[PDB]
RNA sequence: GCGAGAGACCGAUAGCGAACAAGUACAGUGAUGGAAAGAUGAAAAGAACUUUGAAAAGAGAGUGAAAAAGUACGUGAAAUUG
RNA sequence: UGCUGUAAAGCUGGGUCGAACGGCCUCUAGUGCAGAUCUUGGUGGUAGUAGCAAAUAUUCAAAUGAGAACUUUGAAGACUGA
RNA sequence: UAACGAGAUUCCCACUGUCCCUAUCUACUAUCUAGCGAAACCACAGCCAAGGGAACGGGCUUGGCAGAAUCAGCGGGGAAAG
């Protein structure tokens, strides 16, 4: 109900910022059980944190 | 000490309090004075302003230097369907001013003016005038008898009419009931006309020639709340006043330690009751000619319509009248027209008018077609026109 | 009369925005929808669909189209208390133009 | 605890005490006194439509420069308002009142709010910043509120009485 | 300073600044400055239990000589207020 | 609730309250308040009033919860722009 | 006295709402609501005219008059506040 630890935690281990954490919706039970960053590693694996892609910059009209 | 410099006042103690009026629809204050030897005759008329136009017409003034020379003048059109005849008034003279006596009904009112006597008509069931209507039971005689007390003791005789507004465009159901003075003959001639109008359309036509100088009584445009500045009319204080400039700098003397009712103050602007005269009748249409907008030099079959309707009005499918130049009120309004209060003999009141040309074109934008014909003979075949 | 029934609706979103102030254009249209479903269904509880907030956002805070086609289906309230027997659901229409569509009742079918 | 009033029959009364609620106490005055003599069921309907903004709450000693309504018609006054907070707590111990009036077997149907008043409550302190460095108040006017429901010879002259005895005696 | 006995002294805005975790809390860079604040009841017997409420609480009940003593506690004035 | 006195005041009925207090002959004084921009404490009208307006901007849904404009998550729209 | 100057001054070109003479538009206020909620000030208060008066009255004298409760504005008076 307050993820706000796990995504904190999934970004440091996903080593990308807290902009690019995805946590399932579907899944906010599972996620709150998540309280180390070795549960956290393991929703990373499975899918239930998923890691977002990059906002393209695209270089195409600079080139 | 004295102003420095002199200057008039700004605007009129004549037209105070700038207050809202009391109604939307303007009251005659004063009637036509009645002289006997004159056939009987009603004194005003009530209509709906529709909107502006602009005409062509040859000037007739000697000595000007645009005599028999055209000139392009603004017109208003006034939307007026014939009313109808449903009462009439006595009056009585007084120590204590006019009193009415009586008031007469016709048996039959239509809808439109029963809806007057409602707040929530939807929500009624609709009883107003229904034990009245059951007083012309098959003789008829309590109405003879307050028509007789009105012979016998009015002195002011004036009949109650209402608009048929359903035959306008506009979306209001209720009709305006107004008391319309007549003039002319014995107070018995008066209401004899008066109960053999009951029920009755009277036209325009009846009560307005063409080239009269007649007035106009109607609310004025409201504005709302209104500074000085544009409320009076005064001069706007320098641009480096601080704490603003649309203001009056100085609302008074010391002494008299009050303000005074003469100093420009802040209020509400417009929707005032104004009496507007000498405006001269141009033209008055008929609701059944297809050449309304036509004369006798623009021989377009054309109505007084614009291209697109009247901008906010509609189109004007009734009798109307048209007026040089501007009267109080907004679109949709309802106008009183009166008859003039005095003779007038100058070339101005006496001028006969015949007009040249009526503009049509659009009032929704620079429109320059006066037809829909010559709008397609002008650009010729469209896409949407196959 | 059936209480339960989808219709699509064209909404004139332009003339319900004029004037409005631009950074509120696009949450005014959020209301004006939802004043709309209340017109059509006679409903005060009004739901959007996830994916109809998407496709008023998606040209910024002011780039609400001029024109929407609109589902909107009455369901029944299951809740307890609802305090509203009924509820309006609005979602998106996907459709080449919006313009000269008329009211169509859906057969939910 | 000592009510402000006691009940008449105290068999046939319900009461509900709110003390030290932070609540508007002019706020709640005016809602209070909106309510005060009504039946029990006809002021919660009220109480609903107030919260909704088809019907206000008509403010008549607590008023000064505020808005004025339409809905204040009804009661025959311009300014109006609909205190939400204060509905709120009322319609609290209304609910209350009504269950104490259950347990003793009182009919919700009959029940009429035969006392309600609000008394002023120990104020909560707080601070503002002035201009110029300076400290201000920032309290609040708590209120109390109670309620209570409560289920629906001549003698004369020696000649006064002569001359009423031979009164008599003319009429036979 | 230590140890005692007293008074036509003051009686909690008085008497020492301090009757209380008072040179305390708190302020000031610093030297220094420096409060407010006593009283349920003989005894907590400080309200078990039921009920309404998310809860705080309320209503019943209970203890007590008294709850017109419920710790927001003896009495409970005035301003001010319902 | 009244009575007495020109008065300063004294006495008394009812209510509240809970531990001391008064009359008379004298003694004594830190002995009488409407004011001092008096002191300390408390409370009003003002007044539900002034106001809570810089820093572009929020919205839909689900979850949680008695209760969600404001919490969490997702979707979007934005900004800071090294 | 060349150069320099947010120094003071006069004239000219350009420029313009500084002005003739104002109008219109935008955002934030003001406004109305829910929540929150101060302060200055306050002998008592608050309609005028004349008189007399500490010689410029809200109160006194003589007149005019005078009808609940009020909202937004306003800056004549309160010889307004500080
Ligand atoms: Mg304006
Ligand atoms: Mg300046
Ligand atoms: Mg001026
Ligand atoms: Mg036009
Ligand atoms: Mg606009
Ligand atoms: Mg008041
Ligand atoms: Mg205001
Ligand atoms: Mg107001
Ligand atoms: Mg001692
Ligand atoms: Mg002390
Ligand atoms: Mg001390
Ligand atoms: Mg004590
Ligand atoms: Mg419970
Ligand atoms: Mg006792
Ligand atoms: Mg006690
Ligand atoms: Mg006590
Ligand atoms: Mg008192
Ligand atoms: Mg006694
Ligand atoms: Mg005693
Ligand atoms: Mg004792
Ligand atoms: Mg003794
Ligand atoms: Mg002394
Ligand atoms: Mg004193
Ligand atoms: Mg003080
Ligand atoms: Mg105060
Ligand atoms: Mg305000
Ligand atoms: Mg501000
Ligand atoms: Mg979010
Ligand atoms: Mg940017
Ligand atoms: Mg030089
Ligand atoms: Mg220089
Ligand atoms: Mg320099
Ligand atoms: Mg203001
Ligand atoms: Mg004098
Ligand atoms: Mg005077
Ligand atoms: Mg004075
Ligand atoms: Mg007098
Ligand atoms: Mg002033
Ligand atoms: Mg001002």
Request: aromatic residues 8%; charged residues 30%; proline residues 4%.
């Amino acid at each position: 109900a307050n993820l706000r630890t796990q995504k904190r935690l999934a970004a440091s281990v996903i080593g990308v910022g807290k902009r690019k954490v995805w946590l399932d919706p579907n899944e906010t039970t599972e996620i709150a059980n998540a309280n180390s960053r070795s549960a956290i590693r393991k929703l990373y694996k499975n899918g239930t944190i998923v890691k977002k892609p990059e906002t393209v910059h695209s270089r195409s009209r600079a080139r | 000490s004295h102003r420095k410099y002199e200057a008039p006042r700004h605007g009129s103690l004549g037209f105070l309090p700038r207050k809202r009026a009391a109604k939307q629809r303007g009251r005659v204050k004063s009637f036509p004075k009645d002289v006997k030897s004159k056939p009987v005759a009603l004194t005003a008329f009530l209509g709906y302003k529709a909107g502006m136009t602009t005409i062509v017409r040859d000037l007739d003034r000697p000595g000007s230097k645009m005599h028999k020379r055209e000139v392009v003048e603004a017109a208003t059109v006034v939307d007026t369907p014939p009313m109808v005849v449903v009462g009439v008034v006595g009056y009585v003279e007084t120590p204590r001013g006019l009193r009415s006596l009586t008031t007469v009904w016709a048996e039959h009112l239509s809808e439109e003016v029963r809806r007057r006597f409602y707040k929530n008509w939807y929500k009624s069931k609709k009883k107003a005038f229904t034990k009245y209507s059951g007083k012309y039971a098959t003789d008829a005689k309590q109405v003879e008898t307050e028509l007789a007390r009105i012979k016998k003791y009015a002195s002011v005789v004036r009949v109650l009419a209402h608009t048929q507004i359903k035959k306008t465009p506009l979306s209001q159901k209720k009709a305006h009931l107004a008391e319309i003075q007549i003039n002319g003959g014995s107070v018995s001639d008066k209401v004899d006309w008066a109960k053999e109008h009951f029920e009755k359309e009277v036209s325009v036509d009846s009560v307005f020639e063409q080239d009269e100088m007649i007035d106009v009584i109607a609310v004025t445009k409201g504005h709302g709340f209104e500074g000085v500045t544009h409320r009076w009319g005064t001069k706007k204080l320098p641009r480096k006043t601080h704490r603003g400039l649309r203001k009056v700098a100085c609302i008074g003397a010391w002494h008299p330690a009050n303000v005074n009712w003469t100093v420009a103050r802040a209020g509400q602007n417009g929707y005032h009751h104004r009496t507007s005269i000498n405006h001269k009748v141009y033209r008055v249409g008929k609701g059944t000619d297809e050449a309304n907008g036509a004369t006798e030099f623009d021989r377009t079959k054309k109505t007084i319509n614009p291209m697109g309707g009247f901008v906010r009005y509609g189109n004007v499918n009734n009798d109307f009248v048209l007026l040089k130049g501007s009267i109080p009120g907004v679109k949709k309004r309802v106008v009183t027209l009166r008859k003039s209060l005095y003779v007038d003999t100058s070339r101005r009141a006496v001028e006969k008018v015949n007009l040249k040309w009526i503009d049509t074109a659009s009032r929704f934008g620079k429109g320059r077609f006066q037809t829909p014909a010559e709008k397609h003979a002008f650009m010729g075949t469209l896409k949407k026109d196959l | 009369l059936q209480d339960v029934v989808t219709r699509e609706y064209t909404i004139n979103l332009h003339k319900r925005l004029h004037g409005v102030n631009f950074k509120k254009r696009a949450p005014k249209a959020v209301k004006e929808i939802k004043k709309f479903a209340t017109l059509h269904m006679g409903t005060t509880d009004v739901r959007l669909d996830p994916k109809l907030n998407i496709a008023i956002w998606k040209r910024g805070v002011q780039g609400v189209e001029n024109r929407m086609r609109l589902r909107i289906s009455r369901k029944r309230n299951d809740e307890e208390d609802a305090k509203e027997k009924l509820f309006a659901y609005v979602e998106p229409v996907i459709v080449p133009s919006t313009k000269g569509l008329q009211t169509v009742v859906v057969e939910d079918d | 605890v000592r009510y402000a009033a006691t009940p008449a029959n105290p068999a046939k009364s319900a009461s509900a005490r709110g003390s030290y609620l932070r609540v508007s106490f002019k706020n709640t005055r005016e809602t209070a006194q909106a309510i005060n003599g009504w039946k029990l069921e006809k002021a919660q309907k009220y109480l609903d439509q107030v919260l909704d903004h088809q019907r206000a709450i008509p403010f008549r000693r607590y008023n000064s420069s505020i808005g004025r309504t339409g809905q204040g018609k009804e009661f025959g006054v311009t300014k109006a308002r609909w205190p939400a907070k204060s509905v709120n707590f009322v319609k609290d111990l209304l609910r209350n009142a009504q269950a104490n009036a259950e347990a003793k077997g009182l009919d919700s149907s009959k029940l009429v709010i035969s006392h309600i008043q609000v008394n002023h409550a120990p104020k909560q302190r707080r601070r503002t910043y002035r201009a110029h460095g300076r400290i201000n108040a920032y309290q609040s006017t708590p209120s109390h509120i109670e309620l209570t429901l409560t289920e629906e010879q001549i003698r004369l002259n020696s000649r006064q009485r002569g001359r009423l005895a031979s009164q008599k005696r003319l009429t036979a």
